[PDB]
Amino acid sequence: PKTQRGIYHNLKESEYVASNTDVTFFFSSELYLNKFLDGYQEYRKKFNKKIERVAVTPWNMDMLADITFYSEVEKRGFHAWLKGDNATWREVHVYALRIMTKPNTLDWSRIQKPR
Amino acid sequence: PKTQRGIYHNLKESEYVASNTDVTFFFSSELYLNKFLDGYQEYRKKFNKKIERVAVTPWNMDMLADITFYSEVEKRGFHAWLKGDNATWREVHVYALRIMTKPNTLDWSRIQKPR
Numbered sequence: 001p002k003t004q005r006g007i008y009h010n011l012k013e014s015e016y017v018a019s020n021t022d023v024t025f026f027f028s029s030e031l032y033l034n035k036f037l038d039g040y041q042e043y044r045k046k047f048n049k050k051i052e053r054v055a056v057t058p059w060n061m062d063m064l065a066d067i068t069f070y071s072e073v074e075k076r077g078f079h080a081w082l083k084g085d086n087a088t089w090r091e092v093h094v095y096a097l098r099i100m101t102k103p104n105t106l107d108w109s110r111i112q113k114p115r
Numbered sequence: 116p117k118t119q120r121g122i123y124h125n126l127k128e129s130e131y132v133a134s135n136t137d138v139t140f141f142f143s144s145e146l147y148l149n150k151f152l153d154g155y156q157e158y159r160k161k162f163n164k165k166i167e168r169v170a171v172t173p174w175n176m177d178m179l180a181d182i183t184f185y186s187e188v189e190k191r192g193f194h195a196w197l198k199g200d201n202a203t204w205r206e207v208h209v210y211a212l213r214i215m216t217k218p219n220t221l222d223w224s225r226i227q228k229p230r
Contacts (some may be wrong), residue, residue: 047169047170050169051166051169051170053165054162054165054166054169054183055162055166055179055180055182055183056183056186057179057208058205058208059208059212064170064172065170067170068169068170068171071171090173093172093173093174097174097212097215097216100212101212
């Protein structure tokens with residue numbers, strides 16, 4: 001359960017969640033949730049510059065950037081859902097691969113605790 | 116035709132070719148072909164380290180590294196075949212995107228001019 005300081009050590013029970021309508025990321029605190037939501041757009045830009053210096057490709061790396069920012073922002077674990085079901089780290093990466101072929105990118109917003 | 120300096124300005128006519136059995140790259144000179152063959156394994160290691168500094172993924176970036184190294188070595192163009200047929204830059208990247216999910220990596224070797 002949520003600690004006196006507002007922390008969820010078990011991400012599965014967290015009330016702090018963000019979604020892009022396909023994927024849902026769970027956070028251990030409101031501080032981490034807001035850091036992700038407030039910085040992912042800028043991180044996508046920084047991520048692309050770094051990737052492009054390594055290799056030029058026709059791919060949309062936005063989702064991979066989002067997964068990477070989540071891992072960097074959330075310090076108490078990784079917990080995600082894909083299309084409403086609990087997804088493993090690898091399953092989220094598979095989704096990011098398939099998404100690389102599509103031109104448009106889905107944005108993220110805070111949602112209420114799911115079922 | 117091959118110039119007096121051993122150069123092929125039209126890559127499709129080149130006798131300097133390398134293949135990994137799925138993809139074939141054409142070179143404008145023996146110097147470039149050998150530069151590719153002599154350094155692609157080492158470039159893969161370098162490439163992978165650069166990518167990982169940007170993002171950790173479960174993918175095999177070898178083919179992407181190979182495409183990137185070929186683009187760096189061959190100074191007179193890009194000309195490739197995919198499964199025995201002419202393949203555009205985009206089609207080769209599509210192949211690299213797919214092969215990313217396989218742990219094994221095909222090596223490259225010089226071959227006799229095909230077809």
